[PDB]
Design a protein around this ligand. Structure first.
Ligand code: AMP
Length: 125
């Protein structure tokens, strides 16, 4: 049932290392999200994740900025994980965001800690 807590791949807002820095800046400016998955060309070539605050901080800073330098590591998990197993993966890793793949290794979506906590403290379970 981990699919229902998922942000589907079509709803993922992401940055593209193959695009100009300015286009990614605009993507970030037009979204409320704190963190963005970063890929190359498309979401099936995910390279990691970027903090918006950092990107913008270091942009407003005016320092020589290359997007690839702010990328942080991203964890993948199978879509076959149970709710508990997913929860424990979050606690163990301390990750805010994890990527979910199907049996072909293809990206199905992402899960956030935030969404995981909302589901625990609401009426989900
Ligand atoms: N980069 C993103 N793309 C799509 N949805 C996201 C992204 N970041 C966060 N979300 C969703 O928005 C919620 C709030 O995240 P935030 O907007 O960063 O406070 C998360 O729990 C996810 O449901």
């Amino acid at each position: 049932t981990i699919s229902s807590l998922m942000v589907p791949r079509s709803d993922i807002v992401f940055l593209d290392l193959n695009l100009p820095l300015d286009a990614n800046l605009r993507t970030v400016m037009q979204s409320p999200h704190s963190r963005f998955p970063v890929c190359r060309n498309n979401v099936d070539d995910m390279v990691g994740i970027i903090s918006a605050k950092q990107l913008l901080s270091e942009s407003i800073a005016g320092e020589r900025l290359e997007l690839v330098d702010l990328v942080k590591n991203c964890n993948f998990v199978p879509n076959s994980l149970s709710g508990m197993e997913l929860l424990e993966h979050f606690r163990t890793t301390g990750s805010q965001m994890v990527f979910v793949v199907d049996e072909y290794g293809d990206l199905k979506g992402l899960v956030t800690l935030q969404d995981m906590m909302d589901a625990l403290t609401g009426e989900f379970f």
